[PDB]
């Protein structure tokens, strides 16, 4: 099976705080998530281009060249660009990560088009390449990918991350860049058109389907907007009682982000009553103490219910308990939109189908 191992590690917002700069930050700008989500929720100023990757907590690896330069990547389902720093990135932010140097693999071939790479909070410039990228043991040929150069944030010298491998659909790629799995696809190096994460680190399976990493059947949901994969969620309870998404919503898969983030006013109202309060960091802790006497929230999803134990809505860390919801402020015209990320996928072992624009999930092992 193509099998990419993925390692938990702490997260760049973990290094802000251990570095003590994250107050200063925070005073300074306003965070939004849904930026990632929506050309519309950017902020005006935006000098920290790797603002929304704050909470991402797993990380794989991969080579590039011949021969193989290692980098650690973002396996992101919310983005679909790949792209690593060049040697040439001067930033004091690029010296201490992997860089590649095109002078060093053989098989590199330089195109004149430019990349402009945006998750939404200011951008990173840079150039498109082609070379052979080396993916849970697979060799993908003739991949195009970003080599960046500019000023990526003072983040990119405390992310744990090199670079992003975006795993969404094509239609959101910037510049029409072909994504990873797409090439892989289109050469016959995997097995089928699918892919699914397994989260403890864990894995990312190419191509496959491994019952071993679930009990029970399968679900299947159909995605709702081809570009993110973005499902259809029936309703959030909490104690029996309905909290949001009345009446149904729209929900996005992100491993890019460990969160459950979703409405300001639904989280503020969750935070309260699950006893957390922000720190100076800018940190909703909660008494370890207190998990036993938690309510589970339930999500229900075509009809099926995937409840989360107090266990897995809550992070612990060293030195720390802290919530795992966090609030976004989604645009006017946007209906209520949430996101799954790690928390939910911890729990659910989740199958991403390209050849039928659907989603599976089923309770993991």
Request: net charge negative.
């Amino acid at each position: 099976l193509v099998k990419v191992p993925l390692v938990r590690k702490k997260s760049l917002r973990q290094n802000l705080i251990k570095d003590g700069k994250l107050k200063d930050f925070l005073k300074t700008h306003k965070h939004n998530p849904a930026s990632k989500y929506f050309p519309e929720a950017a902020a005006l100023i935006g000098d920290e281009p790797l603002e929304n990757y704050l909470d991402t907590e797993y990380f794989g690896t991969i080579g590039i060249g011949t021969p193989a330069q290692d980098f650690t990547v973002i396996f992101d389902t919310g983005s679909s660009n790949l792209w690593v720093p060049s040697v040439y990135c001067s930033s004091l932010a690029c010296s201490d990560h992997n860089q590649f140097n095109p002078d060093d693999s053989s098989t590199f071939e330089a195109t004149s088009q430019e990349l402009s790479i945006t998750y939404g909070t200011g951008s990173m410039t840079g150039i498109l390449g082609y070379d052979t990228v080396q993916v849970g043991g697979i060799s993908d040929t003739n991949q195009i990918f970003g080599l960046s150069e500019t000023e990526p944030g003072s983040f990119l010298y405390y992310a744990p991350f090199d670079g992003i491998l975006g795993l969404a659909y094509p239609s959101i790629s910037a510049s029409g860049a072909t994504p990873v799995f797409d090439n892989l696809w289109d050469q016959g190096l995997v097995s089928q058109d699918l892919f699914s994460v397994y989260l403890s680190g864990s894995v990312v399976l190419l191509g496959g389907i491994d019952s071993s990493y679930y009990t029970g059947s399968l679900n299947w949901v159909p995605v709702s907007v081809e570009g993110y994969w973005q499902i259809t969620l029936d309703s959030i309870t909490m104690d029996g009682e309905t909290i949001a998404c009345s009446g149904g919503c729209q929900a996005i898969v992100d491993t890019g982000t460990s969160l459950l983030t979703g409405p300001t006013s639904a989280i503020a109202n969750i935070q309260s009553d699950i006893g957390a309060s922000e720190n100076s960091d800018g940190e909703m802790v909660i008494s370890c103490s207190s998990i036993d006497s938690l309510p589970d929230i339930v999500f229900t999803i075509d009809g099926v219910q995937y409840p989360l134990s107090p266990s897995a809505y809550i992070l612990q860390d060293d030195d720390s308990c802290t919530s795992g919801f966090e609030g976004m402020d989604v645009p006017t015209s946007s209906g209520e939109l949430w996101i799954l990320g790690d928390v939910f996928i911890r729990q659910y072992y989740t199958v991403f189908d390209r050849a039928n624009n659907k989603v599976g999930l089923a309770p993991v092992a």
